[model samples]
Target: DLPPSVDWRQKGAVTGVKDQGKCGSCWAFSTVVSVEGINAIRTGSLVSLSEQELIDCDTADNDGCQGGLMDNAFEYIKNNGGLITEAAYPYRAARGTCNVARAAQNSPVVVHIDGHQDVPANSEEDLARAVANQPVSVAVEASGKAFMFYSEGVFTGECGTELDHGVAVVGYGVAEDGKAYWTVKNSWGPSWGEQGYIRVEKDSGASGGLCGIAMEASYPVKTY
Candidate 1:
């Protein structure tokens, strides 16, 4: 059981915020960030992993820049051995051919996790506990106008459980209003939503979760 409060950001496991650009590749960003957090927590060095590798290489089931799932991205990394660093395979924010050679050569930067786990649907408490350990890959309904232009505040009930876009839940704690919330890292760049982050209401949804945050929450695990 985890404590009532934890912040991965303060612990230095959380990396710099990312920008997914115009691509619907938020799934790749979510997956990469979660792995980045775990890798840092386990190895004590945070490294920005590649999202473009997933966009171009994981086309067997996932569509690049068109849309995809974090689970599929995790499977692609597991099946393909590992994922390379962002410095080696930079994100283009667009779909392109998979460079098997580049991916193969940068194996030293490859990150391999023990596996990934899905937090049970509607279990906000469990989701919080997981984030206390490492960042989580989560999906949410982000089509609402409030979410689109969300700047600051402990976000609550403005969105739904439709599960549209993907993001990473980096930590959880009490906001200024004393409301429990999850600190979410977005892929829309630093100019959007609380410097590329948002505080979502915790334990708000009766069934799925606030904006479906608990519906499909998952994260990679690394054994130290």
Candidate 2:
């Protein structure tokens, strides 16, 4: 039941583009974004959740800033009784102590998730299906020269399966060039990519997916 073209941003589930500053909290950003998307779909509210909550509090498993994992982040979210809004727990772009007291005391819980699931590795078909339902957190090799400076047009760059960066796949579609592409939302803010998104080539038949996107694709399951 996956659509030939799917864009969650147009559906008002995806939030505005934001930057991660100099920190490596892209994993947290991706994790939060997926939760926000599903929460919006299920609850009929588009609210921005806190990335810093996970970055600062979910530290035992995830490194917070140095690097982190998606499923690990979700576990922390459900176990910690969900997360507050970004307005409650702000992003410093730098590591600091977890403000559980301040966050829980100052803000109300606006989001709740049960857990996360993974798309089969190296399968864009399953990834697209997952994304058709909600946004998906994914990893890709973002070290390529062209990828770093990508602006417009579908990305057909050269990249290997190093999986050094994390992002979210908002949707999938075919570009003007007629090549299938996945709409990837980066945490590098609005100035990067297509106003904060990059359309990656899909079904390229490469290992781990285009730029390792399918290597570790995942998304959070909202608690209803």
Candidate 3:
């Protein structure tokens, strides 16, 4: 049977990350984050994957104890070859194996991104066009208006806070009233925003920074 076509936004399954509230590994968190959602779509099963393992494992230049960008983590995954599924390598926070497998059932698939783009298309039309050809993961310097606009929590729109660091792309959409809004998912928690979801204008984020200037998607990676 052919796999069902799923847009990036509709593929997420919001899951809270408790306890790790004080870890400095947003890169790892965002990397494994999108994978956790796509993994469910691939495995046909839902499982809360681990980001802590990536935090402890990935060691390029990321402040594993002080938060980092998802782009850096993607680079690490590509050069290092691949990441093991969370089930095979469940998270143990600051405690677990670097590249070992413990389980295989409903595991998160280890995927790789192709290359980086310096000249990003700064519009929703261009962004959608870009994503139509490849899967993408990006970071946005979201603000209070953008953050609190969604159905999420009490976002007071703190300045230069750099709150979110997850991934997803606007699979498909049309410019609304001459303005553009793309669907996105967050890895915070289910009850967070619009049922763990948000929509931001193309090139929205601070300084016209919706998609991270350092990250882009290559293709889809899944296994039976």
Model 1 C-alpha lDDT per residue in residues 61-159, reported as the tens digit of each score: 889988999988888887787788887788899998888565567555788887788898778878888888889999999999888888988888677
Which residue pairs come into collision in candidate 1? none
lDDT of 1: 0.86
What ordering of candidates by TM-score runs from best to worst? 2, 1, 3
Q: Candidate 2 lDDT, tens digit per residue, 1-224?
A: 66789998999999999999999998899998899999989988999999998889998879978999887888998888897899998899988998767667767766889888989988888898999999999988998888899998888877888788989998899987799999999999899989999999999878668898998998888756
Candidate 1 vs candidate 2: the TM-score winner is: 2
Backbone clash pairs for candidate 3 read 24-66, 24-67, 144-157, 152-192, 152-193
Minimum summed lDDT over a 10-residue window in model 3 is located at: 211-220
Model 2's TM-score against the true structure? 0.97
Per-residue lDDT tens digits for candidate 3, residues 1-224, read 21222254355443443234445444565566455545555554555555665676665666665666566665666566456655567555463445444333456455443424422533443455545533345565544565645673323233343545545543434343554455555555556575665555444453434434223332234453
- Model 3, which residues run further than 4 Å from truth? 1-6, 9-20, 33-50, 92-125, 143-149, 152-166, 170-179, 203-224
lDDT of 3: 0.49
Better of 1 and 2 by lDDT: 2
Least accurate 10 contiguous residues by lDDT in model 2: 101-110
* Model 1 residue 210 CA deviation in Å: 0.8
